[model samples]
Target: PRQIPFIIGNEACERFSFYGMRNILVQFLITSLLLQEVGAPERDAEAKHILHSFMIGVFFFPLLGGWLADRFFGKYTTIIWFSLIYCAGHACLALFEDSRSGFFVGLGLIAFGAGGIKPLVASFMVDQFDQSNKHRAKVVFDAFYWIINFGSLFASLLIPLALKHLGPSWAFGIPGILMFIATAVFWLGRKRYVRVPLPPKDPHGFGAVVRSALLAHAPGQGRPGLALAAISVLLALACLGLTEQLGLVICLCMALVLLLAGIGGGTWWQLERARGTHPDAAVDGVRALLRVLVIFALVTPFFSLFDQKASTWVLQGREMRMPAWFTASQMQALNPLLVMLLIPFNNLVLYPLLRRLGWEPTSLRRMTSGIAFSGVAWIAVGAIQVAMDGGEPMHIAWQILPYALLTFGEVLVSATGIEFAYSQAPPSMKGVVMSFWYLTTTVGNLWVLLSNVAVRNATVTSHIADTGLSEAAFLMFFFAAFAFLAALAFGLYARRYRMVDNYRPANLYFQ
Candidate 1:
């Protein structure tokens, strides 16, 4: 508490800013930017594409952020610089309410700003405590996350109201002001915050080790991973060549494929390379992260269900009957509201009850259950969609059921995933690991993009219609199934997974 207010306050305000824009982004694109077309079966498809593409960029920039923090600027300096860029992005949104190109430029900049500082800020908060008060860190971390949801709750409820009554400029402008304040709050903490120094070199760094491993060759040693990686590269190139013929959504899908394949293949080859040059512990760390990547990959489906609260869910909500006091976007409030309650409830009541029954909910178990719950949430969503398509005018309150389930899942997966990622990571690769965690969301959005592309196919659309299911209902069930399968895979793997403790020893000091 002594030195954390600035960051906490900054995060709260920044979340208000991010979620403010994010919650209404689909609506803004549909109603304001005019992405909707007359008689399109895939309503809001273009907006979903845009939102996912922006999300991809938003999560993707952490790579650059993590790299810059380790190699050039320290975390504080990197955060501060990227924050300024973030503010500029907000300004763009506010100023260019009517211009499509200008709004896209704003999104691009915000993606850079948001993604750049994301991995650093939370880790920076971790840097605030020494070994003595480390016990209190969990409390602070809970509050930190709680405040983010607090801001998001309000943003979700209020922003659409602003968009409706206040117009796009004021709707966007308010969040911009909040971002400015967030930046100012962070800047105020400059003197007191602990600044971790940038290391001059790390020969055994994750990147270096990866490079050395991938680039090295042993006599008579056949590198199948390298062959696979080369094939992935060729496929990505082939994808880029086909971009001119595809719709924007399909293009985005291909690009995501390219990005994930390149990174995944590189990581696989690097692990093979680490055997000779890197120490056993480092190689083990790489191997552990590799195994963890499967868990991360499985969580991607959960993210698909989770992130769509803003895109697909809102679009679905817009078709529902709402009370005079509420808007479609306001339905998003249910997520954060439930999160704030569930976190404490799980910690205080649920976990204890489970323990009393002799079922200790380990992180992996919690995450698996969380993911399965997400699948359940989507099941409700699909049911609602089916009702809506059947000419039944549904009340907006129906969404709460799904939102509650998804939030519980979110609490389990998102919060536990952070703890698990940090605990499992080698200290030197903490930022890299965190960045990978964010990348899961990126890939999740990619799935959403790909789904949109699939539905765009004539055969797919025809097949869905022939099955007597509307496209929206079909997609909802599809994602729900996706989450369930991922959960199953996660559970099977978790049984054999070994948990590692990478935390500092007692009484350790800041280096």
Candidate 2:
């Protein structure tokens, strides 16, 4: 518990740094970064795309981070290095507020540093516990998210004000200062924290096992898995055709999707073949990882709507009447504020009350419900959009209803998913699997880009106009429907899902 405070404190300030910059990103881009695109509809569109694309980079680099932690560097060293990179990113944002290329370099650096270190931090925090203390993991994890939002709550509330009044330099510089403190806060705990030994590369690890399964020669049985993987490669290559339309971000993300799908699908078909070459336990771990990834897929749609709170929701709010001092981005402060309140209420009040009433709220059940709630939130926003389009002078205050709904979904999904993934990972694969969990967000944003690209078509815009809805309103409804469908499938699949306990046991003679 002594070292625990440091990681928690570090996470708090780091989040403030990240969210402070993120919440104001779109408004900054519109007014400052993309001034050339100003005075056109393309301006907002470009800003939204840039924000989501930057987010894609953020989530995408977790793969690299996870790899470094799993193979070469311990979590502490990797995290410390990236935290420094993260500091530079903040400085770039402050200094390069005028230069697009300079600002983008800042974004890239931050994405790599922030994204890489993200999975390792939680896994590192949990490493401080053994089987004896693991009983308390769930609650600590809840507070983990709470601390994240504790930072986010203040950042969202104040950073936009800084952007508005302090000029871009101070607004950006402040988060950089917080980030420097974040690095310092984390390093101070280096004295006594549990550092799990570097798990050497396994000869028959998940990759090896999956490879053997895909390539294993069975007498008279065709190499279906191998063929399938080859097909995925071909599909990835073909996806390049859309590069001009979708840009490299979407195309590359979708390429990953196709490859993962094909390879994972083939491995599923021939997983047993791997048993002869690798330990049954190794193959089993691979199977479990694959299974959880399916759950991650369903969780993706919730974010399509959830992440847009900054982009779409902020833009929509700007259209409404609000107090002169109030800004649309500041409304995001409500999300973290609710997160802090809801977590305790849920743990102290909701879950127990539910158990007493006769049904236990499993993680899967909560996740399914979370996705469905996000759908409802989008529908609520769409209704408000319709009213605003009907010429009603709605206040930005009207946006509160949907923010309440969406934040509730966030509490259920984001918080619960973190604990679930951390608890479920095989020890050697912790960082990597956690990164894939973050990859779910990349896929979610990919859906947003695809939707934007869809509407960009000449005919699609005409069809939307025929429906008499504004472009924003149409996308809101579409994302809502997307989540509902995913929720339905998630609940259906969840009913048959298996649960496991993968926490480190007190008995530890490293294999």
Candidate 3:
């Protein structure tokens, strides 16, 4: 009777395709490019960094995809086209088999395609419903997320088995099969969907807003500009990284911050003027989007930790004996399985129970608690790594607890972020707002990138060394604290946020 089937089918196949390659990526990197000898720990640190950087690209590109769809192509066209590109990336992974350049190229393509569609498809599913049925959308969206983990569960368990028995070629090929099925399933919904058209020109679109603000304000209007300028110069220095200059990574990371702040600063300037030009509603809408951007920035750190599970966690897994009884890759399956179980539990058991007990769980409260839980999970990871630093035997099973904690947090923060972003955005901003939401992950990963590079600094390294912790443990503790702090700030913001889910056709195009 609805489009749930399409969303579920697409999620199932796509997650299989995604996690299949990702789960094994750290193991692959450590063994292949980074290591000169088998069973060596020499490259473990570098391997983790590379894996996470690649993941940053994977999640970061979705901003481009979401923007492209929001500004030009509608969701259907973008999803379909990108799905083809996704399949090609997998095909290349299977075909390249051994060439590092070839493998990375394939990965880049997958990021472009897979990450691009990450937000598009999920929100697009909501596009299929109108106000009368929109209430069901949240439940369906939760189920949609559950199905993703469901598909990921299979790939996480099965891909490692293929790697063990069949080798990399076939191990990678399995996900490609799933990608093909995903594309096909998405296509199957062509006729049934109530397709939403792209928004009309924002004349004051995001980019324009940036430009207008730059000219209207004095260069020294706010500290944000100075902060950004400093970052830009540093980022320019970081550009030399490709030339074997380690110093550049730090420079680029600083520049990345400046770049983002510059954008925010520019928008702030335009918003100051926008208040005078447009109707109060349109002006306020722009202001609201900017406010959401602040929240997006605060939440970026949460993604920094969340995305590392596929990268750093995998490398951490390799160091510990994986039971010889369980596939290392299979360990990741726990999160998805838990996510599937927890969403309903939270909605039914936890939330209601809290409500009856006089403590209802607001989305922001859930998100803050979720972030704190992730911080706690990291503390466990860091503590374990501390204990293992002196060559003590650590059980792989210990990870199960952190995995549970982290994924449960994910169910709370990430799942709710979608509904909040969608419900809060103005109709014209739906696609852009969704894109921005995905961009938060991009920004989050960038934080990791910067942190990774910073740790390489002698001063930074020396300070972390004072803790008697390995670099891995150091990062875990740092990110845990980082996410907790952000959650606290987000909780404060959420308290004052205007809750408005009212939908009206504000523009002729939407009507």
Candidate 4:
């Protein structure tokens, strides 16, 4: 209500900072770190690994931010303060690009700060209205998402130009300035924003469940579900250890553990602790948390493909032509720009058309379709890679087709995911749930990390090498298949999913 514009303003600026830096990071790492090293595969791989690892942190830290907002600061204080830190991180990037320690430290700060804001801003936007107007919440949520891309649109289009004409310092610095402006915009609305009350400290978070799960024996009541849990952990650890031996196994194992932990912990807490509610209204709370966890897990694979644009797709781009007519990095502008326009197009035309035709595209259905579309986009990218390797003059314009499809997928999955995750999660777990949304990206990038590691193996490289396809083409097809498989799984899962809109407080008390 009163506070939304400010949130939109903050998003506009901060997104400018985040998406702007992200677009350039690949180029920066390769140019700054590898250009001087002669035929050193280690240098190139290390730089990419560092960048990917940094992204994992950025995506993962939303857990901390969401927890702090839900249990401690609420939304207003959390968003405003983190927004400032977000600005500072960007400033560091602009000024310290050449100093290895300085640059990485700055990236760490930005990732932390940026991750902090992910869940808070969305939840904060949701906090602006209550049950009575909450129905309208979806509309505001759409606008919130739209504004985020609007920020990204400007950043994507202009930042590349700045990097070209102005150099990296001013290119990065402009986003830093926008981030500052974003913080101030949030500050401007601080006094007027509606704020949610913090959940009582007595309620548990994910850590409590993890600790108890580690200690519990499934056979004993109130004891940790240690047996199944320990077995799962051992398996996950073994998979982690296999990173050196089998890359795909690492992706499979990590995804297994993350998905399983959320399920196991959520189920254990409810079954062991939620029976008749011993104390502190934990029963319904845990049940709601589990429900939220289920949704987050289903959505994780979509992010696995979404976040690949800057990594996997960028690798694919190298094989494509960036005519002397345009900058290679600037090509990302298509994604953001398509995101900006498609959102409105869907809202104004697509949704209305579907509604009038006796069918409305619900969130779950949209998300599933999004994953399928992503699969198709990746397939198209793979096709383009095939053409490029055939010695065809790279038509940069053809990429616009796949970019549109991917952006459409983004609007369907990511934008809808924000509102869906927030609205479905119980008030107490809003931040935690939102963190899960961001965490999905971590899982997604982890897939990329795992893929890169796999491709490094000599035997695997030879197998793909003999395909007459470049590494880029092979990887594109790999991820395309990944998305297609995920889309199929998502379709099946969506059928079983019981969608719960858990936006209001029940005022349950600890007995």
- Candidate of highest lDDT: 2
Cα lDDT of model 2 by residue, 1-511, tens digit: 7888898889888888999988988877777754456544557677788888888888888788877876888899999998999888888887788898889889888888888887777778878888588756666666765567667888988999998887788778888899999999999999978878887668778788998999889898988988998999999988888898789888998999999899989899899999989878888888888887888888889878888998999888888998889888999998878776776788899989999999898888888888999999999999999999899999998888999899888878777775676566677766556667778899998898888788878899899989999888888899899999999999999999878878664101000
Lowest summed lDDT over 10 consecutive residues: which window, candidate 3? 502-511
TM-score of 2: 0.90
What's the CA RMSD of model 1 in angstroms? 3.5
Better of 1 and 2 by lDDT: 2
lDDT (Cα, tens digit) per residue for candidate 4, span 1-511: 7677887777777777788888777666666742344543444455556666777878777767877887788877877777777777787786677887777777888888888887677667767887687666677655655556666666666776777677778877887888888889989987888776886655355455445434444444644445556566666656766665654434454856554784466455535543322343444455556665666666666676777666555555655666564555666878767866787799999999999998879988898888888888988988988988888877667778778888898888777766666666656655465556666677766767777777778999899989988777788788788888887887787788777776573200000
lDDT of 1 by residue, 184-221 (tens): 99999899998877766767766666666667776787
Give the per-residue lDDT of model 3 (tens digit) for 1-511: 4666976788778877788888888766776753343433336656655566567566667777777887898889999998899898998787776776777778878888887787687668777878587656767655655566666788888888888777787888888888899899989988988778886777755544444444454445554544554555566555656445443333444455556666565466456654444455665566667777777777788788888887777777767765665655678888878877887799889999999999978767887887788888888878877777779787788789889888888877777775666556666666567666766776777777667667868898789779778888888889888988988888888888877764652110100
**How much is the lDDT of residue 485 in candidate 4?**
86
Residue 361 accuracy (lDDT) in model 2: 87
Q: Report the Cα RMSD per candidate.
A: 3.5, 3.9, 5.0, 5.6
List the candidate 3 regions with Cα displacement exceeding 4 Å: 1-10, 33-42, 70-77, 122-143, 184-198, 202-256, 462-466, 491-511
Residue 386, model 4: Cα distance from true site in angstroms: 1.3
In candidate 1, list every pair of residues with a backbone clash: none
